[PDB]
Amino acid sequence: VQLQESGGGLVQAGGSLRLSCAASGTIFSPHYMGWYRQAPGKEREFVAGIGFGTTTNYANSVKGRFTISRDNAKNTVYLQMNSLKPEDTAVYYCAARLYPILGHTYWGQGTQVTVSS
């Protein structure tokens, strides 16, 4: 049970990008699946996430510009990132939790998104 991602690449400020990640190996439907980023020197920060029984919240720097969306049938997390900026630049990872344990347990491979300036 682990996830793989595909969709990262280069794009300049104000552009658009759609992110996709597919969970596999699960006997059931995972409760939580979200998106996380990692600045070139900072820590692993939260971008967007959807818990099924809980909220579907975004981070402050993320709010209003990106859209997270899960489809439980195909078991896929989507992050539509528009109005990008150099501060949006980070290595984006796919995190998933099988049960509502607040925290993070499963992680993805990781895709790089670059916004030049």
Added chain:
Amino acid sequence: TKGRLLTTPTRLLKLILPIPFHPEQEYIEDAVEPLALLVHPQQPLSYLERLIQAEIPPLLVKDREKLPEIIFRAEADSNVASYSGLGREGPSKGDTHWVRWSGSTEIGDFIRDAARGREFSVTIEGHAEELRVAVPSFKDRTYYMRMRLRRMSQEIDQMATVKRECDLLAHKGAHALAKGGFAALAAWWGIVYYVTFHTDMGWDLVEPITYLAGLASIMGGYLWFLFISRDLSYKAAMNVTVSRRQNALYQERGFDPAKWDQLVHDANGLRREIKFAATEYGVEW
């Protein structure tokens, strides 16, 4: 060489008294085999007198013979008769005070009163030495009753422990729909928990289903109380217990592993007899 008053399975009493006689036309030298008399607790002492007079030589005075007079004495003694119920099992004292008893006293009443001492006296007229008979204790009088009560209470247990297992191997099966009802709710829980916390659809969709299912379980209980559940369904439970109580040919007497007409009221009716006997003797039991 003291005498005995024995108790039999029936109400009668067997009286052993060693009369000092045998080399006698008239008693006015080996003794004769001790006299064994069968008496009833309701016949008076006068009948016991003319009973002993028959198995005794006549009493000669001058030209004529006459039946010997027989006098029964007991240790009976400030305004309350000191009853002990011990009889021969008592302590005994150096010298006792004897009193004559009327020939109209029933043997049963005379014996229970004389039980305050260890022995009651029997004096034959014309013979100077008086005989001695040990009064039976309360435990003596109720030997066959107590020994039969112990026998009754033990067969009842050999018969109760099979009704016990019959009435406990009928609950694990009859409570199957109760465990299945719990499994239905826990399985219904998992459906509700999963769809909310593991599926996109929200409370807008599932809650009516939970309401329609709630009314369904209420109506299912209405069709259930519309069967034999009303009032006492114990008749249906009694049929399953009656089928489980099959007869067994294991023991000829006190048959094991079966159930039928449990006559325990005779074990209680016998205990009421033993305790009533303890009261008139003035003892606890």
